A paper describes a structure:
Therefore, the β-xylosidase catalyzing the removal of xylosyl from XDT would play a prominent role in reducing both of the resource waste and pollution to environment. Here we present the crystal structures of LXYL-P1-2 and its complex with XDT. Each monomer comprises three domains as some GH3 members. Sequence alignment of LXYL-P1-2 indicates that Asp300 and Glu529 might act as the catalytic nucleophile and the acid/base residues, respectively.
There are two monomers in the asymmetric unit. The electron density clearly shows the existence of xylose and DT. The xylose adopts a pyranose configuration. It was surprised to found that the glycosidic bond between xylose and DT was broken in both of the monomers. Although the E529Q mutant did not show catalytic activity in the standard enzymatic essay, it may still have weak activity to digest the glycosidic bond of XDT during the crystallization time of one week. Thus, this structure should be regarded as the enzyme/product complex.Fig. 2 a The 2Fo-Fc electron density map (blue, 1.0σ) and Fo-Fc omit map (orange, 3.0σ) for xylose and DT. b Comparison of the overall structure of LXYL-P1-2 in substrate free form (gray) and XDT binding form (green). In the complex, the amide group of Gln529 rotates about 40 degree to form hydrogen bonds to the side-chain OH of Ser466 and the O7 atom of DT. The side-chains of Asp109, Arg174, Lys207, His208, and Asp300 stabilize the xylose by forming hydrogen bonds. Compared with the free enzyme, the only prominent conformational changes in the overall structure upon XDT binding is the movement of loop Ile222-Gln229 with the longest distance of 2.5 Å. DT molecule binds at a pocket formed by several loops: residues 220–232 and 324–328 from domain 1, residues 379–383 which links domain 1 and 2, and residues 446–450 and 529–530 from domain 2. The hydrophobic environment, contributed by Leu220, Ile222, Ile224, Val227, Ile232, Phe324, Leu325, Ala327, Leu328, Ile379, Thr383, and Ala447 form the hydrophobic wall of DT binding pocket.
Author numbering:
A (entry chain A), B (entry chain A): 48 to 803
Write the structure that this text describes.
Amino acid sequence: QWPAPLANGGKSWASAFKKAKATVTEMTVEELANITSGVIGLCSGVTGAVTRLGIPEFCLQDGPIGPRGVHGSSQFPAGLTVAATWDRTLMYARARGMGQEFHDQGVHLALAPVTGGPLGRTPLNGRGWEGTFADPYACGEASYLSVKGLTDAGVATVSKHWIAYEQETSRNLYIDIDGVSQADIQLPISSNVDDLTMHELYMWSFAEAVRAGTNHIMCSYNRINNTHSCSNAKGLNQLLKTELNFQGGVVSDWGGQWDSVPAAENGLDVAMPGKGFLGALGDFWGATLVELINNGTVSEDLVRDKAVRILTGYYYLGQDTNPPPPFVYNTIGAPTLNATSGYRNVRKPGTAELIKEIGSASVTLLKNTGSLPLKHPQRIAVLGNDATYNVLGPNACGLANSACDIDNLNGTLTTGGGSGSALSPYTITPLEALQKRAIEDNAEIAAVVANSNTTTGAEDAIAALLPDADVTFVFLNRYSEQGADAPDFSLGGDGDNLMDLAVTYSSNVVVVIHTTGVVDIEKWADNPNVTAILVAYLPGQEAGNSLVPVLYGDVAPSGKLPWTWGKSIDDYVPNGVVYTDAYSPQSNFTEGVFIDYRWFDKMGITPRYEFGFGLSYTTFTYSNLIVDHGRWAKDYSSVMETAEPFAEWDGTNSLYDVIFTVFATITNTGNLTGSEVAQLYISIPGDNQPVRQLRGFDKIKDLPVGDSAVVTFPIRRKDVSSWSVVDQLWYVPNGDFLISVGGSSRDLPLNTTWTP
Amino acid sequence: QWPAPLANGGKSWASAFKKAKATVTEMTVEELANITSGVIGLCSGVTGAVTRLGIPEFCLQDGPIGPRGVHGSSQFPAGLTVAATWDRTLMYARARGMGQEFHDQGVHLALAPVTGGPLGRTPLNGRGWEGTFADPYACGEASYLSVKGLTDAGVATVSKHWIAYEQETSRNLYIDIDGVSQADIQLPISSNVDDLTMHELYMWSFAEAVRAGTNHIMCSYNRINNTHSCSNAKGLNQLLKTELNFQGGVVSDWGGQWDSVPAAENGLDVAMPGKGFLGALGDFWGATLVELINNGTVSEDLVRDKAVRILTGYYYLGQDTNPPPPFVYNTIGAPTLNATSGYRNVRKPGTAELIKEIGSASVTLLKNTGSLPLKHPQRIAVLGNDATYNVLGPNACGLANSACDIDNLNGTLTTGGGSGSALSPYTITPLEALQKRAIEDNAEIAAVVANSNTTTGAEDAIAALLPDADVTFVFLNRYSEQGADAPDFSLGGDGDNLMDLAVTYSSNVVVVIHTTGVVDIEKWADNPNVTAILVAYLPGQEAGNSLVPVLYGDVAPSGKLPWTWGKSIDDYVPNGVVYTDAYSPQSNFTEGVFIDYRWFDKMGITPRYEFGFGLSYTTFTYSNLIVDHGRWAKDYSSVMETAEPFAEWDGTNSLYDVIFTVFATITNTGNLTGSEVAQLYISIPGDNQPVRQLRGFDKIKDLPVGDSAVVTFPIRRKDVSSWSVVDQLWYVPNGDFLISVGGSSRDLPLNTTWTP
Ligand SMILES: *[C@@H]1O[C@H](CO)[C@@H](O[C@@H]2O[C@H](CO)[C@@H](O[C@@H]3O[C@H](CO[C@H]4O[C@H](CO)[C@@H](O)[C@H](O[C@H]5O[C@H](CO)[C@@H](O)[C@H](O)[C@@H]5O)[C@@H]4O)[C@@H](O)[C@H](O[C@H]4O[C@H](CO)[C@@H](O)[C@H](O)[C@@H]4O[C@H]4O[C@H](CO)[C@@H](O)[C@H](O)[C@@H]4O)[C@@H]3O)[C@H](O)[C@H]2NC(C)=O)[C@H](O)[C@H]1NC(C)=O
Ligand SMILES: *[C@@H]1O[C@H](CO)[C@@H](O[C@@H]2O[C@H](CO)[C@@H](O[C@@H]3O[C@H](CO[C@H]4O[C@H](CO)[C@@H](O)[C@H](O[C@H]5O[C@H](CO)[C@@H](O)[C@H](O)[C@@H]5O)[C@@H]4O)[C@@H](O)[C@H](O[C@H]4O[C@H](CO)[C@@H](O)[C@H](O)[C@@H]4O[C@H]4O[C@H](CO)[C@@H](O)[C@H](O)[C@@H]4O)[C@@H]3O)[C@H](O)[C@H]2NC(C)=O)[C@H](O)[C@H]1NC(C)=O
Ligand SMILES: CC(=O)O[C@@]12CO[C@@H]1C[C@H](O)[C@@]1(C)C(=O)[C@H](O)C3=C(C)[C@@H](OC(=O)[C@H](O)[C@@H](NC(=O)c4ccccc4)c4ccccc4)C[C@@](O)([C@@H](OC(=O)c4ccccc4)[C@H]21)C3(C)C
Ligand SMILES: CC(=O)O[C@@]12CO[C@@H]1C[C@H](O)[C@@]1(C)C(=O)[C@H](O)C3=C(C)[C@@H](OC(=O)[C@H](O)[C@@H](NC(=O)c4ccccc4)c4ccccc4)C[C@@](O)([C@@H](OC(=O)c4ccccc4)[C@H]21)C3(C)C
Ligand SMILES: *[C@@H]1O[C@H](CO)[C@@H](O[C@@H]2O[C@H](CO)[C@@H](O[C@@H]3O[C@H](CO[C@H]4O[C@H](CO)[C@@H](O)[C@H](O)[C@@H]4O)[C@@H](O)[C@H](O)[C@@H]3O)[C@H](O)[C@H]2NC(C)=O)[C@H](O)[C@H]1NC(C)=O
Ligand SMILES: *[C@@H]1O[C@H](CO)[C@@H](O[C@@H]2O[C@H](CO)[C@@H](O[C@@H]3O[C@H](CO[C@H]4O[C@H](CO)[C@@H](O)[C@H](O)[C@@H]4O)[C@@H](O)[C@H](O)[C@@H]3O)[C@H](O)[C@H]2NC(C)=O)[C@H](O)[C@H]1NC(C)=O
Ligand SMILES: *[C@@H]1O[C@H](CO)[C@@H](O[C@@H]2O[C@H](CO)[C@@H](O[C@H]3O[C@H](CO)[C@@H](O)[C@H](O)[C@@H]3O)[C@H](O)[C@H]2NC(C)=O)[C@H](O)[C@H]1NC(C)=O
Ligand SMILES: *[C@@H]1O[C@H](CO)[C@@H](O[C@@H]2O[C@H](CO)[C@@H](O[C@H]3O[C@H](CO)[C@@H](O)[C@H](O)[C@@H]3O)[C@H](O)[C@H]2NC(C)=O)[C@H](O)[C@H]1NC(C)=O
Ligand SMILES: *[C@@H]1O[C@H](CO)[C@@H](O)[C@H](O)[C@H]1NC(C)=O
Ligand SMILES: *[C@@H]1O[C@H](CO)[C@@H](O)[C@H](O)[C@H]1NC(C)=O
Ligand SMILES: *[C@@H]1O[C@H](CO)[C@@H](O)[C@H](O)[C@H]1NC(C)=O
Ligand SMILES: O[C@@H]1[C@@H](O)[C@H](O)OC[C@H]1O
Ligand SMILES: O[C@@H]1[C@@H](O)[C@H](O)OC[C@H]1O
């Protein structure tokens, strides 16, 4: 085994550690078992109180778009959607806003963000949308800022899911309900991950989360090399708590804990949900952990270290001197918990405008043949239930946005299904917003929003409506959800039918896709009747009013794709989702570090739309690439430090030191003002190395016609490193490094060589 | 027989008559038959050209809300809806706006307004909504202003339908299509109307239409005393063309003409639609009328008088010196007419705001227990497909708003079905408008707009949503249409179910009814969970934005009911709709003059909501009734004059002279500013006379709290007259007249006696 290292508070939590140790020193064995296992309450999870010492219950609450199952709050855009902005300021402000609302609702610990698990090995991942980029570097940057935004608002974070949690299928949470136990059916999928892949690929974003000060981390459902993540000594005690120097608590996912003793010894700190959800998801600690200590199987001091880890967050964020107000909403639901809900409104001035701005900044133009931007069209047709409201109400699908019937017309896809969803005070529909703009132009506008296959008359309505239209907007979607992967890339609902009808009857079709990921558009993407295609991802509540200004040219589109859009699912990493009824299911990560565009680049597969692709209404020319070797600096700014070994280590040094900076220049060479995401890729020399790896991005805002601006990329030591499996450390390999800059992963007009 | 009197141009058309006679004098027999029978074209009806003399084809076009089947136009509110405003200025401006759009689309003759047929003998009349009030006096005033507004814009009018056209059922238009002829199935319903009833009840509004200068009149489908209206000598040659002194043309309804010779001799002028609609609706004139003249059966001079009547309008409105532009839309439809459509936009600045104002002025508050006006509710539920768009598009139901399937979710009922409908450039939905106001108050709002009986989950969505709501808006409707009467008072669609669910789960339910007439609300109107009830009638395109300001108190509601709302259909005139398969179906108008509230008042039946009932957010006190006998004046202002005989006639005199004026005073005695419709009723002494008869209305706008204003009622000679069947003239009977003033037909705090 790898022994459990003791918390010491590290960099920023030293004083809070000290108060945590003082309190925990006073605790009895019953009290230690109480704080470390869940109890019944209104939140996703609730830690027992330590009543005698005045430590209250902590509310742990979903989710990564804001607190789930609460009224009086805003529905923020999904992580996928903010990734697609490529705007650091928006990644932070989104998180800070979510945090404000978490705090004002009474949440102590936010079950957020998703910071690298699932990272994106398969594009069918039913919950991939909760994360950000299918790229370690960019996911790392988003994860850093998301964590910082949440904690800066006074909410502790529980970053998730550690680690190699890359498929929902056979995730097999522990559950024992009505005589049928998952242990007797099938064990969780095992992620079989080589050491290099674990370091260079899956750990990257978690390192950034630890550096940003995440207070906790949640261990996933999957197994790793046939050992449960939540009792994987190598995972938690070694890689997380030793190499990453993590100082906070490891919280089990809900049914992630499979056992009592291995869990306490191998790095687990908090058993969730404990007595919540009827005890059906395992209840391995609590009174049972009291007996394990008193009879000497589990070390008392070991358990005190778990308590210390939990309380460090409490004191660091000042939840003692500034308590959160009470959490008033039943987010569990009857009959599981019968208990009434109060009411509180926490929506602040500015939040609706921020959510709108994220939408306008993310929406991504994949195809424009000249129909966009719109001028002042006079006869406008609109097709698709995605254009309008859920017919049962925007929250009809319930507490996790997953309970409406398989055929329901859910309206605009504003968030995905599951624990990462949230309620919505309203939906600004695409149709409401297009209609407002139509009225200003004295135009007419009509929408067919029924099911084009199963409602009588819809097809003929469509036939009758489209030919005369100046433009036809088609709104498509693809719902996906926690607990299943998507079967394939197929549009949800009547999507395919809408598109076949649309091109039969209109030669100016503009397609807008609200989705949790990549969809199959192969039948029509090259039809010249589809004059424009845009993906708007998951925009939360301001869906229509964020889209329409971009469509009409008020602001040029500036979003780019945060993953690869291949022409077929066969173009990706093989065995993305393993289906088997084998009792011990296996997923071998044979691809290694080569996921998403790294796979495409290495096998020479040409995607339909590459990673980092997006059109504007203008063009940008790249020039004057400069590598400034003299432009280096100490890492002073992190909240916490890791202990990742590296070759050049000398006591005063860091893996996150900036060792040089790359500069380049962009010129708007088109006819309209626009923003541009500049991207930097490095080819690190070695055996079996990716052709190139994203190591920088910078977004210039609203570059006027003919103007220029400089983009700037700080390069850290780690960014040019490789991990030595033989030596067990990060090193900068000798050799020629290629540095590329440009507008996508495949449009890189500038390059240069750098040698250390 | 009653011989056909010759046109002479009467009062305002004298010079146009002269030019008409000159032109017609030059016409051959072929040319006379061409102008007097319909030909194929893009409009509802088209008169043949007289090519040699440069007289083009005239476009006749539906309908009484504006030109039908046209893009580029606005959907105005229905006549029912403007009646409910009780605002003369709005009745005029609505008509003038409709006229502008008629003209700018190229229409020569508008098939509008509905000016007393159907007037409202039965509240089940499928097309009652096209007219205004179920009251001769008020229908007369609306009819005068509607006609004036249309002609003032340069469009000739064809006022309809003459006369005693009081049920759609067995209207039996002539049609002979695919070997099956209506003549071999069933004759039109016969209206058996006594002479007093015809004069005091059905003729009243047509007299006002003739006085306002209607250029034509359309004869109805029904028979009168077992003679078709369109060949009823007594109807057309005598009552219309002699007593009413009508100087314009009688146009057949479409399939209203049953014969060639009786029609030419008994007063018909224009055979419509002629060769249009495949000749299937009879084609009795045209080439056949050429042979009838040349072989001497039909007098040539008689036919010249028809031509003269048609051309008088053309010259009077200046359609020669200012031609209408071309009519560019196929309003017939393929396969009946295959022909392409151009495009023109005629929507002017100001029209959308006028249609909104009519909505805000008409919406009628029937019940308010204190829930209205709304303050700033934070959780708002909305129920009903009426709250949102037609799922197939607002115009999906086609050229006459009547072709969507029996179950379709048609969305907000903005106009009724049939030839009196029109297309809509958009629908401002109740839900869009409530949502905008919710957003301003930082509130949440959710709508269940599916079918609550047949869509899975809707009922539970409803159960789950309503209890927590501060207010629940329920939107109900009742579509009806030309060519059928309503079976009963039942809400359309899932109405009944919505209301049962609403009161189970909310104690603050506010009901809004969009309808073509009275509906059965008896199950819930007295439930204290229904805290407010409003009828909004048919608001055209600005449905939501006209309603919401009234709901939120920006303006107090000031509409009142234009018909009686009885508790059951058994409370009305019996035999309202006769159903039979008898070849010659009969309707005996045994009730005489006693329709609508005259029936209720006479039989001592207490309606649920009386004629002229509506609540405000304030109250008004009535005081200081004055009859000013000295306040009389000559009738100088009419466009045309009738020749109605009357006892006091002396050459310089008129039946429309004002013989006194009634004044009264209203004081706003509540807490909020509001508008008030003041109503005047006279009890004319006689045998079998109504208890009281509306003879005045005046609307005070925005009366501040504690302020007073005077309402003024001019009383004409005709207004205190009766018709002598023995003498065949109007007379003022000797005796005591009761004069009542107040806020409804049953809330009349002021009264006084007047003797001639
Ligand atoms: C899930 O399972 C996979 C299953 O394999 C696990 O992965 C393994 O992870 C361990 C670390 O826990 C690796 O152990 C290290 O192995 C080094 C030798 O590697 C070479 O030999 C092995 C065995 O014959 C091969 O498998 C390797 O091949 C792979 O890597 C190469 C190189 O890139 C590729 O080309 C191959 O194709 C494979 O991908 C190698 O050829 C070994 O040197 C290393 O030794 C040090 O580290 C430990 C500390 O843990 C010390 O105890 C030991 O004393 C050595 O440390 C001293 O020495 C160095 C100097 O040499 C100093 O710098 C130190 O500070 C110190 O004083 C270590 O044992 C194993 O190789 C790796 N396998 C693969 C295939 O990746 C996952 O960890 C497992 N995960 C979980 C979560 O359970
Ligand atoms: C659909 O059918 C109904 C079926 O009846 C038709 O109605 C009738 O309409 C005609 C007019 O075209 C009426 O004719 C007039 O009758 C007068 C006599 O009426 C009394 O007797 C008759 C017959 O016995 C009764 O039916 C009447 O009863 C009804 O009215 C009374 C009174 O209120 C009620 O109490 C009853 O219960 C009934 O409702 C009466 O008791 C008759 O005097 C009148 O005579 C003059 O008019 C014509 C001009 O058309 C002259 O030719 C004639 O010379 C008289 O005119 C001179 O005399 C007067 C002075 O007396 C002068 O002032 C004149 O200027 C002139 O020099 C006339 O014949 C008939 O009564 C009426 N029936 C009913 C039941 O209403 C509908 O018209 C028909 N409609 C259509 C469209 O086809
Ligand atoms: C299994 C699971 O994930 O359950 C939890 C409760 O904590 C878990 C975390 C999860 O995020 C949470 C909160 C969610 O938010 C999910 O979005 C969520 C799910 C993914 C879903 O999960 C499932 O459908 C399970 O696969 C499903 N499992 C089974 O039917 C099953 C039974 C025996 C052996 C193996 C499987 C299940 C359905 C309904 C109740 C319990 C279990 C249950 C669950 O009801 C929700 O489940 C419960 O609320 C619940 C669980 C146990 C008892 C009572 C209630 C779900 C929702 C909200 C729909
Ligand atoms: C019967 C009738 O009212 O037809 C007209 C055409 O001029 C009439 C006036 C009417 O206002 C007009 C324009 C309308 O606008 C109506 O809203 C309207 C109707 C009320 C409707 O009328 C009916 O449904 C008839 O009762 C119906 N009648 C019969 O089926 C019938 C056949 C034989 C004997 C007795 C009855 C019918 C349906 C479809 C085509 C022709 C007749 C036809 C009609 O298609 C529309 O009809 C046609 O367009 C049409 C008529 C004949 C031949 C070809 C087309 C209708 C619409 C638009 C739906
Ligand atoms: C509107 O949103 C709805 C949710 O709020 C969407 O419904 C969900 O959609 C997904 C598919 O996209 C379904 O997931 C699959 O469903 C089945 C499992 O169903 C049952 O099968 C057996 C029963 O014998 C049993 O094993 C299961 O427990 C289920 O009872 C499988 O095909 C897949 O494995 C996968 O889980 C959801 O089931 C469905 N939810 C519900 C509650 O029906 C809906 O698709 C949205 N509308 C549109 C157009 O996208
Ligand atoms: C949405 O608006 C729709 C129209 O655009 C509404 O559909 C119409 O609604 C009325 C009833 O409210 C129906 O009128 C009745 O229908 C039938 C006649 O149907 C057939 O019966 C025989 C066939 O064997 C034949 O004689 C007829 O020609 C018909 O084929 C009778 O019950 C009545 O006499 C009456 O005419 C319309 O038929 C219906 N239109 C269509 C095209 O189906 C719809 O109701 C609206 N939705 C809601 C919720 O109100
Ligand atoms: C272990 O955890 C238990 C569950 O959290 C804990 O119990 C709970 O104690 C809290 C206070 O710490 C109580 O909360 C409220 O109760 C009283 C009235 O009874 C109020 O005056 C207070 O304001 C307070 O809000 C809970 O009632 C109680 N919950 C349950 C389910 O019993 C135990 O105390 C913990 N045990 C140890 C050893 O600390
Ligand atoms: C009786 O009515 C007929 C139908 O309206 C009428 O015919 C039509 O005549 C018009 C002009 O009055 C023609 O309109 C266009 O034709 C020529 C080109 O062919 C253009 O140069 C002109 O600009 C004009 O717009 C119609 O083509 C014609 N319609 C049909 C169906 O024949 C007869 O002329 C009328 N008969 C009499 C005796 O007047
Ligand atoms: C310690 O406690 C656990 C849980 O009750 C029990 O299974 C185990 O056998 C105990 N050890 C001894 C030595 O009794
Ligand atoms: C494009 O639309 C036109 C109608 O606008 C249609 O006739 C043509 O077949 C369509 N083209 C394709 C490739 O579907
Ligand atoms: C009114 O609503 C309440 C719930 O708000 C319900 O319990 C009660 O039965 C309802 N009353 C009626 C008369 O339906
Ligand atoms: O937040 C948790 C989610 O990430 C996990 O997968 O399911 C349990 C949830 O409550
Ligand atoms: O306008 C006409 C309408 O009033 C009549 O009833 O049907 C024929 C229509 O075209």
